[PDB]
Ligand binder design. Structure first.
Ligand SMILES: [Mg+2]
Ligand SMILES: [Mg+2]
Lengths: 525, 525, 524, 115
């Protein structure tokens, strides 16, 4: 189709305008005195939310160029929330700040490529300063504290998370489910988690978490690329009886197969979800068997001459629950017999002895850690279904935060960490003046979050920011109480992972837009 | 009347657009391969010129704001031509360059006041480097050389100027008049010059020199402020009868008096020109008498009770010619008797002996030096009236240039001097980053003249400019021959006073416009 | 007032469009098969003419920029007609050709200044080739022939001019007046001519010749610059009585004085014309006296303390007629007494003996040559007033042509001389490629006249032009008879001065316009 | 051959005396030789340096001497590791000239209406 092409400043201003609509819409929710955004549905009453992720999802602009701008920031900003479970809004606010001053510089005559390098250098330096400022989170006392803070000052949640990590470890897999009653429950069952997400966002049945949940599903394990639905009919019909969901773990699912599964599942004829098999090559084949042994199913390998048409319900494995998001898939409580699993774990441990390479042993040690490690299940209890679902949400959110805290620690929240690091990089310089400007652009951008939070509170941002710079360490401004002091002590903090991710992703998109000279899109026609 | 008010960038862009029209029209004539500008003169066929001063005079824009911009640069740029007799076009090109980059910086967020200070610092430093680069012009050989170059390689003119300065000295008064025949003539006649210009630019009858020339005029000497024309009627009627011009030397001429003289003179009923009396206070009264004794007139002092109504032709003094520009007044060949002048000279010499103060003696020494000094007159000869007028013009122009060369010397022309000084100020810095930008704005602007000259020649400016910076001293590019070398030796040079004035004035207006936040003018109605 | 400014190509295209209107309108009359142009008159029926000068004078465009273009070409093209009495149309066609291809080159990326230099070099070379191709015109037989050809093959006119030049010389002053009867007459009266034209084109009363004629006028001689009309009143009133015209010969006439004279004369209040005094400085003073002695008037010198208010009719000189054009002024039959004139001639001859310098002698010899030389007067006779005026016109035109022929000779006409010279400069080159283009632009432009003439005839220009180049010398195409041969022999020729001036002026303006980057004019 | 668009500007510099059968063909030659500077000039432009200056300096050298846009240093391009298969540069130029030659010699175009 005929395209509309724009260049230089004309394109960059369009891109910026789009990012402003996105940022200006999400940044109203930032801080403890954040405002509400009303999202229309028409299929009912409008939604009122302070969740910047919810707002961002809805943002799409009519102007094709402006839209491209907003969609580029959204994409990258969302990755921050996927990594640490928070920071999408922060990343968006940072991106806006970097792009705004960045383009101003480009217009002044600065070299875009140098500006980018200046920014990137300021960021790498900022991340290093974040590590220095970071406070560890190791002992269970700390884990409980971070969990409590992340749970809106609920000591219960903090305790639950602490106990859960004490069973499966810090690197262990932890899941959250609905409670059976008032009492909370914690059990460790046979399960596994691998880094593979849904193959289509249309499988999502829990839009709130943006994940796919399957109750008592069958699991198909095929070591082939499924492209046609013809070979699936016999298995789909067998799953259509007994009325249970189906998880397809194959080398890949594409073409007609994927499409048909996407449609049929949305029509509600058969609940199905598909994900790629973990790893690649020989390792993929081996891990598919790990899943098989764990779920008590048999792998349908065309390599040995098996067909998918000859696949019976007996060939399918099964578990109690499956949780699939954009990046990970979690199998909970496999039907695999303890004898069979322990048997394969011992088999792999034998392979660790015969291992010649260190690499080979580390990869095997990873597979045994999954199979033997299991999965922790937290059943959140309450009086009332409403209270139960609500608490469950806080537990899931607090869990993600705590995990991130155990990885890289915690730093002052309220956007203090960023303005602190920025203040320590005043003497940072580059190879030329253009890069120097890029550095200053980034350092001034790191004040955006704090200033926005203060603004929402109705206080003078410049004054607060100026005072916070005066102090050192995790000294900052508690926007909630309007008191200065140690942010960590006051309980206002963020996982170092969150702040880091937000900044790095923000700078990623910002750097790309600053170095854009041409945009191509379709015509309004 | 109702006013139209603009602020900030809105105002500055309007101002800039106006300066561009001015600059872009004048800078096409810059250099030896300068282009022609066609100026329409409805009364007759159009004028074709390469004189940037002629072009500038005609520039007036429809948009009131844009016009204000062009008129501000015109006013200040003309002052460079009034001081050194050249550099108006160079100043205009510089002004454009400083304003353009200056406003770009302001839009970037730079502090206007700091930009100005940065610019001014770069200029003061540039002027000092210009002094260092300057080559003196003292000996008559050099004076003849500079005069020849300024006369378009006419050795005759160089000689004439050299001889004239050898009679009256380097600080001597030299005038140029029409020749009586083929032979050139040099004589010293009774005359004086004082630092007072026309009271209205509407007295100008010689627009190219931008001066007022009166042939065999009467001179009125009144020690009072003339505000009404009623008191002038009897004198104006007496002057209307001898069919001769009138120059009025009074304390001041304002109000109706000035207006009536402006109109009546433009109508051509009676040629009249007015200037203030030289000096102030008691000294003014004394110098008015010097003029009286010299012109053979009587001064009409209201202090003793004399009135302007009883002023007869006998009270008025007279000379052969009077030349008046924006700054100076020159009376040539007064009718005063030798006995009367020598009488007052001896009288003042008596006051030098009674002088108690050094200051008082120096002021008296100045008035005797004028009365006794006289004026040197160069009569330019030729074979034709056309050739005579033409040569006379080159002599007048070469005279101004040579005088300026004797004051501050000469530097490389073709805009080399500017790019040379700029290259020596790379390490110049200010108090903050904003000032640093201001410095770089000015240094980059100093390349405008050269680059423009090269552009008119059809060569790559960036390459030539780059090569010129590579050299040192008065090494540059001769745009005429396309050869590099010593500019002074090749005969391409400019009085150090010209280049200096052009830059300082250019920076003056540029600095004012950069620090403008509001503009007020009338409505299009 | 606010101005409208244009730059670069935007300005040059406007300028070109204006030149095309001018050129396209005038070039239709070029050649023996030239077309008519109808010029509208506010009062009366329209004028039908083949005179490109008449057409040019009427051309003025509504677009201010386009107009500037047309007026620039007009101004310079007219100078060619002032110099040789012909070639304004030719200059206009050349200008068009040079500008058209010139701008095309500029747009191609060629350097305007180099293009100009290339053109100028081609012209200087072309002028030299014109001199070489030129055929002298010295003997009376030749003078009569050139005069006859310029008079539309009238042997009578050729003879008249020949006789006239035989009396006063080749550098003599010759005038033409109305005849008193059928017989032509030729007499030499005391008169003088100096190189000073009218100070305002509004003094023109004979628009055909573009000159000013005054019958039995008074002559005011003042050695001062007249700027006010106050000092003229007493003299103007005295001239208003006796109802005769007034010629003002002063150092200069400007400001109110000039304006008032311009208006009063166009209102018919009193017929007045003003010109500057000849020469400058001391020489000017001396020549004013020559005119005084010749016209029998007195010079009003303010230097000795004379005033213009005390000027009587007795102080004014008088002649039988005065002819003033843009460049020259001619005083015919002064009332000065023979004793007074012969007296001053002898006085000047005495100054020649006391002359130390050669320059001084030459200048004195020039003044005596005017006073003693006199002026030849040709009274054109005919049977009817209509035939008399008609013949008089042909005599005046043929006279100018013959004069120009005696100065620089004659070359082939019909635009052959230009195309001939062009063909001999094929190997001419410049300092760079841009200059080379400039040269070719000029050489190709020199074919414009011939091609236009052939076009008006309805023949293929490229074919004729191609054939003419094939020959040599004054071999060309007679557009009238459609036969090739020696142009001079066939009687188709132009004064070398005409063709030269036309080309040089054409290239002058063309060069200026090609090197124009800005234009300034008033708003609509 | 040297990369960074040096090879093209180098070859072009060695063909200054190349002439054709008439002036028009001579212009065509100059058009091509000036066009071979496009790649380098563009690369330099993207780097934020003066193309005319760099191009001018590269012509000054000989062989595979050029400008390393990355490091801003001049020298042997092959040694510095900036190069392109001779087949690439050749193909790029020949195909570029192919279409360019066809469009220059186009007098008519036929296409459907906006409907
Ligand atoms: Mg979260
Ligand atoms: Mg004629």
């Amino acid at each position: 189709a005929a395209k509309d092409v724009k260049f230089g400043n004309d394109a960059r201003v369009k891109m910026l305008r789009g990012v402003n609509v996105l940022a200006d819409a999400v940044k109203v929710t930032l801080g403890p005195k954040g405002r509400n955004v009303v999202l229309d549905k028409s299929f009912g009453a409008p939604t009122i939310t302070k969740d910047g992720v919810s707002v961002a999802r809805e943002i799409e602009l009519e102007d094709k160029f402006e839209n491209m701008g907003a969609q580029m920031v959204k994409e990258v900003a969302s990755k921050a929330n996927d990594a640490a479970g928070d920071g999408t809004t922060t990343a968006t606010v940072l991106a806006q700040a970097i792009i705004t001053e960045g383009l101003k510089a480009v217009a002044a005559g600065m070299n875009p490529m140098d500006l980018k390098r200046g920014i990137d250098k300021a960021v790498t330096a900022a991340v290093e300063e974040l590590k220095a400022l970071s406070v560890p989170c190791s002992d269970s006392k700390a884990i409980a504290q971070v969990g409590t803070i992340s749970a809106n000052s609920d000591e219960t949640v903090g305790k639950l998370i602490a106990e859960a990590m004490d069973k499966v470890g810090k690197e262990g897999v932890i899941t959250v489910e609905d409670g059976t009653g008032l009492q909370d429950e914690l059990d460790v069952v046979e399960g596994m988690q691998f880094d593979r997400g849904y193959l289509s966002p249309y499988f999502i049945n829990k839009p709130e978490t943006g994940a796919v949940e399957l109750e008592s599903p069958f699991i198909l394990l095929a070591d082939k690329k499924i492209s046609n639905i013809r070979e699936m009919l016999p298995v789909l019909e067998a799953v259509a009886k007994a009325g249970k969901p189906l998880l397809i773990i194959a080398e890949d699912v594409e073409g007609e197969a994927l499409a048909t599964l996407v449609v049929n599942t949305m029509r509600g004829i058969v609940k199905v979800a598909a994900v790629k098999a973990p790893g690649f090559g020989d390792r993929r084949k081996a891990m598919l068997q790990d899943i098989a042994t764990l779920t008590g199913g048999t792998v349908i390998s065309e390599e040995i001459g098996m067909e998918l048409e000859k696949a019976t319900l007996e060939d399918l494995g099964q578990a109690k629950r499956v949780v699939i998001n954009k990046d990970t898939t979690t199998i909970i409580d496999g039907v695999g017999e303890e004898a069979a699993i322990q048997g394969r774990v011992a088999q792999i441990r034998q392979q660790i002895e015969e291992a010649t390479s260190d690499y080979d042993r580390e990869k095997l040690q990873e597979r045994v850690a999954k199979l033997a490690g299991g999965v922790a299940v937290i059943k959140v209890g309450a009086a009332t279904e409403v209270e139960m679902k609500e608490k469950k949400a806080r537990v899931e959110d607090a869990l993600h935060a705590t995990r991130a805290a155990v990885e890289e620690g915690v730093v002052a929240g309220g956007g203090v960490a960023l303005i602190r690091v920025a203040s320590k990089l005043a003497d940072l310089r580059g190879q030329n003046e253009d890069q120097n400007v890029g550095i200053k652009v980034a350092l001034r951008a790191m004040e955006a979050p704090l200033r926005q939070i203060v603004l929402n509170c109705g206080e003078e941002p410049s004054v607060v920011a100026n005072t916070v710079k005066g102090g050192d360490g995790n000294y900052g401004y508690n926007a909630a109480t309007e008191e200065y002091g140690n942010m960590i002590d006051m309980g206002i903090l963020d996982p170092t992972k969150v702040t880091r991710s937000a900044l790095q992703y923000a700078a990623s998109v910002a750097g790309l837009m600053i170095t854009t000279e041409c945009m191509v899109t379709d015509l309004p026609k």
